[PDB]
Amino acid sequence: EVATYEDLISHKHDYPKEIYKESHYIRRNTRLDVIKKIPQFEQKSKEWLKQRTESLTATAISVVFDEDPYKHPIVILLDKCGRGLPFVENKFVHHGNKYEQIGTMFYSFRNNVEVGEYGLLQHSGHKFIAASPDGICSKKANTGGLSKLVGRLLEIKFPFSREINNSGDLDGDICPHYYFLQVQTQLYVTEMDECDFLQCKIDEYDSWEDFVKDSNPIVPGLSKTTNLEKGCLIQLSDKNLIGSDDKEKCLYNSKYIYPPKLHMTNEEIEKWISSEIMNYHNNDLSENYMIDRVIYWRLSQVTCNLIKLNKEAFEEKIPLLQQFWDYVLFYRQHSDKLDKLIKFVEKVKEDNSAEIFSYINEDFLSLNKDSKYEPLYQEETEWRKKYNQIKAKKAQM
Amino acid sequence: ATYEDLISHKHDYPKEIYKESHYIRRNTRLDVIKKIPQFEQKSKEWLKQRTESLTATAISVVFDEDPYKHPIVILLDKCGRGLPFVENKFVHHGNKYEQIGTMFYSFRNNVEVGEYGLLQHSGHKFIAASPDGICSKKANTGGLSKLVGRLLEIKFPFSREINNSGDLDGDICPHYYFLQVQTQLYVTEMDECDFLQCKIDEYDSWEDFVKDSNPIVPGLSKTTNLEKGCLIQLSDKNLIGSDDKEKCLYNSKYIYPPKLHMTNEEIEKWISSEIMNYHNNDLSENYMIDRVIYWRLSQVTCNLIKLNKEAFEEKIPLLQQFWDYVLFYRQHSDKLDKLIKFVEKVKEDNSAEIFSYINEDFLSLNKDSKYEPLYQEETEWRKKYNQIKAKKAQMYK
């Protein structure tokens, strides 16, 4: 049974020796140390911004493949040329950005491994391919020494309304296809083998009293209703949006202070919250954000499915990405042709990818006589068909 | 040596029932005040009470004995043609720490202090006062108190320095405050008032706060040998994020600690509890949690002021005349407009001509009245204030 919280720590992945013996553990560990020491620049500023303009992110890969249900490839090309829509904050990103770190903490504790986060990483061979993994498991086991999970990527998703499918295809049902391709790109860029896809559902208590009432008697960190971890959060509101009737916009721009660890006793929580408040006027966040309220949460559902890298299947599609990127670099040096392109895309709408990229390919070949490039998206992909089938089902009601 | 040695028992009453006449009268009078109906402040009949009476702060001005305002300002204020009040640093400072003064007095003098709203004299309903507090019969350590019915007046001067010796009517207690206390004693029908003046400075952080704790009496400061504690500052949602930060600061509200000499654990527990349940505090609807303030008492003086009943009742006919002028211009709007025009012709400080004109306006519709013009000669305090203004305004020396 579970006497203390230490019995919840899985030791299935502990490594017996003090030095890796198997080839794949050695390679994954060495690769991880090479991923470390890679220069990562101060976020939101200077060369960090430069890094994003020279590469496609992993979220764009599913769209350039004409296999995304929400966006079409032209949106990515225009976005990378500086003529894209500004981003409006919504409820989905808010929920995911709010609890992502809680997922990381749960995974690190239950699987007994340290998880580090790293910024945008570019592929050594194809610098225009970049990814930002949520975390990569280090060699260090939280309790003992080494872990068999070294170099395993971690992807945490907190679906706002979508319900987690437990069985079916891994590429379609259990993991949505657009996320699956994102994981594949992250694995290719990091040069790692496997990634744990973690999907979680969370619900929130009404007050501090309900939080204390749900505590397991001797293991306070567990919930009595869901038998999973629970804890606290400090929500901070934006000073620029604090005084408005548009409250959703204020909520979606909130920042959060996260607890130091899981399975804190109630006194440890109270001491932590008091410490954050009593020293908040010395927190840089105090210049732009104000203390709103305390959030009380408990985990309700956690699924974890392993995703492995299919190297050849990804490298078969690299010529497509190289061609698309050549179009991006093309319209970055010809502003006039870009203006005419935007006119044409407004003429024939976004979803008609065949005619759009036929025009783009002819525009490209006009200044590249010897180019062997042929137009893209001449046929709809099968995932494009499947998504169009779903759109047709929805539009009938 | 613990904090219990700071509690004075000089004012404890030995018997379980008051024997002396003045204790009996003050106790009975106080119990009569507790049953006086007090209406919801800032709303409904509260506003009605303010229109029917002169507050105690206006009395020093109506006597032509105030250094800041002149008598005409009160008449125009009571008729609805006065300036709006702009919040400033002095009122902010006093309203910020008044409660801390009350707590210090209650602790050191071993008496419970109750607060009561605006009270009218019943004999002269147009005379009203709102005392900061009145000491009840109950001693904190059990039993009766000799301080029953004693008024409490707390002043936290921002820049004015506290004079320790000299005249009570001029030096120790500023004359305008003295007249305010006299009116409060007359309205409540009590005998004595403790005039408390306090100076405060604030620590930079919680670490400095704990370092300044006296070794053997932790609730006392080591540098100033007086009490120290905490406050929770709350900012207005409507003025937060504004370009005027001073205006936002002066409109802040505060949550006060339950007691003095709290241990560090008790402070941390109090702050954590106040934060976690702030969404169940009605103040959260309009105010948000700003920061924690750490304060220590640096100087405290206390001087007893007794009521001069005859000296106050000599000035009641003047107040009745002034109020008759107010009620007069409340039913004759046209004469009020012409009056404001006349006050623009000659300035506010020329009380003689203004109230000579007012007396002529009054007698025009009240032929028999026996009223004579007011402020025809300058009072002795008016002379002294003009002397000080002249000293400041001179070019040489």
Swiss-Prot record, chain B:
This is Uncharacterized protein R354. Signal peptide: none annotated. The chain holds residues 141 to 537 of 549 of the full protein.
